[PDB]
Amino acid sequence: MKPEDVIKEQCARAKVVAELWHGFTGGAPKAALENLVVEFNKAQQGRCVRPVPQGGYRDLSTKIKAAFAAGKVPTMAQAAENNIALYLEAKALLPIESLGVKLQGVNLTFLNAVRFGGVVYGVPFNKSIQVLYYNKDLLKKHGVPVPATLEEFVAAAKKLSRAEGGPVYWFQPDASTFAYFFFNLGGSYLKDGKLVLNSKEAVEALTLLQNGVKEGWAKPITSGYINQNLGSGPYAFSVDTSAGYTYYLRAAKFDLGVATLPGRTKGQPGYGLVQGTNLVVFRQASKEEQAVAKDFLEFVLSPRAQAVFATATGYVPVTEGALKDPVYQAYAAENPDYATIVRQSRYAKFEPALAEWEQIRFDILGQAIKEAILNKADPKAALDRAQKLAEDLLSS
C-alpha cells in the first residue's frame, strides 16, 4: 500500500479517529507527514490520526471557513499565524498547554508567532526559512564567490547574466520574494500598529526587482515553481523556501548549492521569511479526539519525529532536542545544507499575524507586485493602490 492506504486501514480499525486537514499536495512534505502518522498510528490501541489533503494552504483555509459555516470542523489542521488570528475571532481553537502538550524546548521565534494575548494556540510543525539556492557549477565557471551581501548578489547576477546571455536570478513576483528584499532594505510592515504596504523600503524593494527585469539579470517565473522551470535558460540563484529543497535537488541538472541569504553587510546573513504552518486543535472536537491530538502533538515534538520530518523535507527542526538526535546528526554530517538551513533559521522575520493577511498578501500586495513586474506599473503607484485597498479591507 501507499502510506495513505495504510492510514485508511489503520483508521477503519480504530475506535477513535482525529482528522488532521493539511495543504501538502505531494512530494516529500506529504510523504513525511504521512510517514509520521503511520508510525503514530502503530503506537496506539485504536486511536488514530487521519490526514485529509485539502489542496494547498489557500484551499485549506477556504475549506476550514466552509467547515465553520457547515457546523463541523476536523480535530486538527495546519494554520499560518494569520489563520490562527482569524480562527481566534470565532473562539474556535483550544489553548495547546491546557491540552497538556509540553512546549519546553520549542524554538522561541516559532512559539512567539503562535502566542496571542500570552496564550499559545498552535504547535509549530512545518516551519520553513528562505535560503539562497544556487548553481555551484555556473558560479565556479565565471569565478564568482557565493554573494554574502545584497550589493555582491546584484553584482554577481549582472556579471553572470552578461556572460551567459540571459537573466540568472530567477524569482516569483510574489509577496514571499518581495519580503526578502523589503526586510533586508530595512522595511517593516507595521508602523505604530498600522499596516503600511507603500513605505519607502517597499518602493525600493519592488523597484530593485523591476530594474532587475529591465536590466536583464532578474527573470520573473510566472508558470509553476522556480524548480519546475529549471533547464529553460541559465540559472545562478533564487531566494526560496527551505521546503523547496527536495524539489530543487530532484530537478537541478547542475550541482545545487544552498547558502545563507545575502545581507545588508557581511556582519550577518540577511533575514529570511519564515513560512510553513502550525497545527491547531478545534474546541468542537470530542474529549477522546482531543486526547488523540495531545498524544499526536507530543509525538510530533519528539526528537526523532522532528529529526526524520526536517531531514526528509528541508523544514527547520522546531525543537532544541531535534538537533541532539543522532538521526539528525548523521544527516547533517553527510549534508552540509541541513546545517545551512538551520544557520539561516537564526536570521528570521515574520509577516503580520493579522486575520486579513492571507487576502492582503495574495490579492492586494501580490497583485501590486505582479502589476509592477509583469505590466511595468510604476512601483509607487502600484503600492499606493495596494495600501488603499488594504486600509479599505481593514476598516470594512
Ligand SMILES: Nc1nc2c(ncn2[C@@H]2O[C@H](COP(=O)(O)O[C@H]3[C@@H](O)[C@H](n4ccc(=O)[nH]c4=O)O[C@@H]3CO)[C@H]3CC(O)(O)C[C@H]32)c(=O)[nH]1
Ligand atoms: N495561505 C497562506 N500561504 C502562505 C502564507 N505565507 C506564505 N504562504 C505560502 O506558503 C508557501 C511557502 O510555504 P512552505 O511550507 O515553506 O513551502 C511549500 C511549497 O512552497 C513548497 N513546494 C511545493 C512544490 C514545489 O514544486 N516546490 C516547492 O517549493 O513546499 C511546501 C509544501 O507545499 C508560499 C509559496 C507557495 O507554495 O506558492 C505559497 C506561499 C500565509 O500567510 N497564508
Ligand SMILES: [Cl-]
Ligand atoms: Cl503573493
